[PDB]
């Protein structure tokens, strides 16, 4: 069963600058140092693009602010995060979010990522739990934090997570993890790459663009979609449902795409550089 | 829809063991604890045990901890009580309940419960009833409330059950609950209350029906 | 930790107010009380948590309060069915239930109808003999019966119950025997069995002599 547990929160959200990011190689073309041109749907240069914040202790040990939205999805998302502790675990690409209504759902335990579409039961604020499990440390993180009922369901896939939780260990960078999103004539697709932002603090001016992981023949009215998070159940507390969880703090930025064209630059090894409008 | 039934109760020897089934439909099972609460006769429900939805985590009372193991396949959505070293005070009607929440280290109440099963802790053996009458007094002794009943002694086990004139008197019948002695075996009676002049009058058969021995009796009652 | 609930019974007529008196040795960890209903031949149903709030399908009249160590369950107006005995329970970090409360219909106290049986024939010839005085349609639960043999006190030799409330005339019976082998029954003489009870002015006996 699930739990609310916002209930309180409404402050309003920060924005900040997509300086020259968001960008991705819209196809499989092997291709040389040459000039391109290609007009898709993308995230608008240097967008007032919106910053969130997931759980945030705003308070010397005194609150626990916590406010995921679920977020219209107009035409495409994108989708990134520092988040060093791995607190995020997919997402809830959907339209209506509830019975009656097949939607999308990403999930990734760690080791390999598994993806459904169903007519789910998503509670208002779904989340994982993370937790030990009495076998030397070891955790299993059921979902049905997530949703009360899915049944009679037609699409699933499984491949490895997306989330590479590299040998960073320290904390300079939190190789911010870095997503786009879009679907087209019920195809969903899927563009992220991890890279170190030794900055501390927001996005960079530097450019790397992502790439197709994996195309998703879905088929589904995706209108609005709800980030997923991992909370980590607390031990005996009293009361379980609306209270302890949520071991680290979290935050993701969020940019909509918009149909546009830019002109790209390749290299002798493929990898772009730089847009304009 | 939500509904739990168990299964598994019964007779016992002490020092035995046994596994207590609890089949459960109409929720998404394996997303709950569930506890086990057992009531003796004439006393308060005592909580048992509860086991984590998944099985990570066990407790128990520590009326029978170290004593009883708590089980669960959630492929199968059913619930298992493992018993061993079945005292005598253990005999109760048990009942399986879930959680409201994920009992991990920490327990709801129980919100919705089972139908309970009865289990029997006793070195006696399956015996059926000896029926003897309970013959009235004079003619009225009181007026108009003539007294006569059925004594069954010696019996095991309940259920049991009486019916005065083939069921259809049911008026003013009085049948008592059984209680067990130092013998270990089981005995109550059975009683209706009924016009002093009706007695003898017309025929009064008490049958008693005791299904493990398979024996059902009739019996006439005369002043 | 023992938990304690008060009194032991409540005996109402319908409709009037009653609260149920819950006392705990050390103080609840915030407030995780609960209670639960059950009729005889029935399971518990749930009807409220946190000492407070009212659960699904239940009736507004049901409400309780309290903290700490002190807690009641109040039920404002009674109605037929709500007449069963109410747990106390309380849920932090290990379950504990109460002793357990009963809720009675009260009326005008009645006389019991008090009769007594001797073992049949066959009964002697058995081996085993049992004498059966009963107590016939009465009230309250509370009625103390004590046996003469001889009119020689016994005790520590008798079983006795009493059948539940009943639906319409909400009374109660009271039978109670002898653990008695047939070698003590032959050497007496007359039997009896005689109640202390609220209906009775004195303590009424209703005894017997053995060969008639
Ligand atoms: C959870 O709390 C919010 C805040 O008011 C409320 O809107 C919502 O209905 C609550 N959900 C449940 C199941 O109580
Ligand atoms: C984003 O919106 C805020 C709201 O006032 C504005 O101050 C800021 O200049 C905007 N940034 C843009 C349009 O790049
Ligand atoms: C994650 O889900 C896959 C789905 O088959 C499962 O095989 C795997 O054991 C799960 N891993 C964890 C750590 O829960
Ligand atoms: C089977 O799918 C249909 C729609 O495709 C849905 O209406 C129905 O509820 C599903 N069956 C179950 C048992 O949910
Ligand atoms: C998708 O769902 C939304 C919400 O009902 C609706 O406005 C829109 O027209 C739908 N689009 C398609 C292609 O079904």
Redesign the interface.
């Known amino acids: 069963?699930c739990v609310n547990l916002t209930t309180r929160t409404q402050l309003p959200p920060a924005y900040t600058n997509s300086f020259t990011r968001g960008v991705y190689y819209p196809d499989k073309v092997f291709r040389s140092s040459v000039l391109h041109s290609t007009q898709d749907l993308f995230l608008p240069f240097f967008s007032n693009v919106t910053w969130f914040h997931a759980i945030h202790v705003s308070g010397t040990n005194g609150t626990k602010r916590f406010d995921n939205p679920v977020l219209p999805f107009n035409d495409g998302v994108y989708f990134a995060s520092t988040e060093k502790s791995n607190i995020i675990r997919g997402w809830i690409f959907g339209t209506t979010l509830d019975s009656k209504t097949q939607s999308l759902l990403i999930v990734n335990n760690a080791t390999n990522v598994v993806i459904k579409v169903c007519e789910f039961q998503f509670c208002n604020d779904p989340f994982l739990?993370v937790?030990?499990?009495?076998?030397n440390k070891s955790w299993?993180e059921?979902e049905?934090r997530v949703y009360?009922?899915a049944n009679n369901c037609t699409f699933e896939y499984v491949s490895q997570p997306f989330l590479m939780d590299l040998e960073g260990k320290q904390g300079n960078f939190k190789n911010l993890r870095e997503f786009v999103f879009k679907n087209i004539d019920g195809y969903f697709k899927i563009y992220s790459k991890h890279t170190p932002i030794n900055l501390v603090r927001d996005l960079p001016q530097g450019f790397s663009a992502l790439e197709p992981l994996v195309d998703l023949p879905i088929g589904i009215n995706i209108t609005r979609f709800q980030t997923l998070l991992a909370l980590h159940?607390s031990?005996?507390?009293?009361?379980?449902?609306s209270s302890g969880w949520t071991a680290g703090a979290a935050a993701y930025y969020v940019g909509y795409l918009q149909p546009r064209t830019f002109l790209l630059k390749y290299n002798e090894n493929g990898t772009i550089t730089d847009a304009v409008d | 829809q939500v509904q739990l039934v168990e299964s598994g109760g019964g007779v016992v020897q002490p020092g035995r063991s046994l596994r207590l089934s609890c089949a459960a439909s109409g929720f998404?099972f394996s997303?709950?604890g569930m506890h086990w609460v057992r009531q003796a006769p004439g006393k308060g429900l005592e909580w048992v045990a509860v086991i984590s939805?998944?099985g990570?985590?066990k407790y128990y009372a520590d009326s029978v901890k170290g004593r009883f193991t708590i089980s669960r396949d959630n492929s199968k959505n059913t619930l298992y009580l493992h018993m061993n070293s079945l005292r005598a005070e253990d005999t109760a009607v048990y009942y399986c309940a879930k959680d409201?929440?994920?009992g991990?280290?920490?327990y709801?109440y129980m919100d919705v419960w089972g139908k309970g099963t009865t289990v029997t802790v006793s070195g006696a053996s399956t015996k059926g009833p000896s029926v003897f009458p309970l013959a009235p007094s004079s003619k009225s002794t009181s007026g108009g409330t003539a007294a006569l009943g059925c004594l069954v002694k010696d019996y095991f086990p309940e259920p049991v059950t009486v019916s005065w004139n083939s069921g259809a008197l049911t008026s003013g019948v009085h049948t008592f609950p059984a209680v067990l002695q130092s013998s270990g075996l089981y005995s109550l009676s059975s009683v209706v209350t009924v016009p002093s002049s009706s007695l003898g009058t017309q025929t009064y058969i008490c049958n008693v029906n005791h299904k493990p021995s398979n024996t059902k009796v009739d019996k006439r009652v005369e002043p | 930790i023992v938990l304690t609930q008060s009194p032991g019974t409540l005996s109402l007529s319908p409709g009037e107010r009653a609260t149920l008196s819950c006392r705990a040795s050390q103080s609840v960890?915030?407030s995780?009380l609960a209670w639960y209903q059950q009729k005889p031949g029935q399971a518990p149903r749930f009807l409220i948590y946190g000492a407070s709030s009212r659960a699904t399908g239940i009736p507004d009249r049901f409400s309780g309060s309290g903290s700490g160590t002190d807690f009641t369950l109040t039920i404002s107006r009674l109605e037929p069915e709500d007449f069963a005995v109410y747990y106390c329970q309380q849920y932090?970090?290990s379950p504990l239930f109460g002793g357990g409360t009963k809720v009675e219909i009260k009326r005008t106290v009645a006389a019991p109808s008090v009769f007594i049986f001797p073992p049949s024939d066959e009964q002697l010839k058995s081996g085993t003999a049992s004498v059966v005085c009963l107590l016939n349609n009465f009230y309250p639960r509370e009625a103390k019966v004590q046996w003469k043999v001889d009119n020689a006190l016994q005790s520590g030799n008798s079983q006795e119950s009493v059948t539940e409330q009943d639906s319409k005339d909400s009374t109660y019976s009271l039978s109670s025997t002898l653990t008695l082998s047939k070698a003590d029954y032959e050497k007496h003489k007359v039997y009896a069995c005689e109640v202390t009870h609220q209906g009775l002015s004195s303590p009424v006996t209703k005894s017997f002599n053995r060969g008639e």
Request: proline share 3%; hydrophobic share 15%.
């Open positions: 069963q739990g937790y030990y499990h009495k076998n299993m059921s049905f009360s009922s159940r031990y005996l507390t009293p009361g379980d449902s | 998404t997303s709950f939805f998944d990570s985590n409201q929440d994920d991990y280290y920490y709801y | 960890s915030s995780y932090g970090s």
